[PDB]
Amino acid sequence: MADPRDKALQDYRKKLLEHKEIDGRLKELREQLKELT
């Protein structure tokens, strides 16, 4: 925007979303492990 510091802020958000997006996949693949164990 008006600061490089804001460019930086906007990237944290993509990562917050990214951390979530992965956690959902991770858990679906995880359930499957449990049956095999």
Partner 1 sequence: EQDGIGEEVLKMSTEEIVQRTRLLDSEIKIMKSEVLRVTHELQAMKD
- Contact between 8 and partner 1 (CB under 8 A)? yes
**Residues 26, 20: Cα–Cα separation, whole Å:** 10
- Contact between 22 and partner 1 (CB under 8 A)? yes
- Contact between 30 and partner 1 (CB under 8 A)? yes
Question: In whole angstroms, how close is the CB of 28 to partner 1 at the nearest point?
Answer: 10
CB 7 within 8 A of CB 1: yes
**Residues 19, 25: Cα–Cα separation, whole Å:** 10
Site residues, partner 1 (CB under 8 A) = 1-3, 5-6, 8-13, 15, 18-19, 22, 25-26, 29-30, 32-33, 36-37
